[PDB]
Amino acid sequence: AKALIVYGSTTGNTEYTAETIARELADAGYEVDSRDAASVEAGGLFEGFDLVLLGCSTWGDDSIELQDDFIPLFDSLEETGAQGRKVACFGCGDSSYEYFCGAVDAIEEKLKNLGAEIVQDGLRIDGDPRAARDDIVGWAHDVRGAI
Numbered sequence: 001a002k003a004l005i006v007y008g009s010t011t012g013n014t015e016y017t018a019e020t021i022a023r024e025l026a027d028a029g030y031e032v033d034s035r036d037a038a039s040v041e042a043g044g045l046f047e048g049f050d051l052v053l054l055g056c057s058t059w060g061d062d063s064i065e066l067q068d069d070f071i072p073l074f075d076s077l078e079e080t081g082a083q084g085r086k087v088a089c090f091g092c093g094d095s096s097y098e099y100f101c102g103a104v105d106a107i108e109e110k111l112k113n114l115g116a117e118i119v120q121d122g123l124r125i126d127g128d129p130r131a132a133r134d135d136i137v138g139w140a141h142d143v144r145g146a147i
């Protein structure tokens with residue numbers, strides 16, 4: 001299986017998150033292509049991949065904004081090829097906020113309307129992903145046992 005991981009990380013939390021998952025997938029024998037949203041190019045980005053993992057942090061106070069590097073991809077997700085594609089989402093936030101990880105909820109909803117298959121509900125990290133380390137290892141394990 002070949003997987004694409006694309007992440008949008010401001011203070012590298014979600015970045016750290018993306019690495020933990022990749023290691024997980026690689027150890028399992030997956031081929032893993034990992035890309036920072038900052039440089040990705042949206043059209044057919046998902047083509048030739050058996051699994052597409054998408055990560056993004058939640059920002060904003062009383063509004064939900066998506067991590068900055070991510071926006072442009074988010075805007076161009078219909079150019080992707082997400083139709084019939086096997087996807088899962090992840091991201092870091094803080095529960096103290098009104099829309100916890102609301103950026104996760106978004107990417108999900110969008111994926112869903114484009115026609116992707118949502119293999120697993122989103123990993124929503126509250127806090128330092130470094131302290132949720134095990135939760136991550138496990139979600140990755142659960143995503144794989146769902147393809």
Ligand SMILES: Cc1cc2nc3c(=O)[nH]c(=O)nc-3n(C[C@H](O)[C@H](O)[C@H](O)COP(=O)(O)O)c2cc1C
Pocket residue numbers: 008009010011012013014015057058059060061063064067092093094095097098099100101102127
């Ligand atoms: C000013 C700003 C506003 C934030 N807004 C949101 C919020 O609306 N929802 C949420 O769950 N997290 C909120 N968070 C927290 C970030 O998502 C969080 O600090 C996260 O770990 C950043 O991850 P990243 O480094 O990958 O970009 C906010 C953090 C700050 C500093």
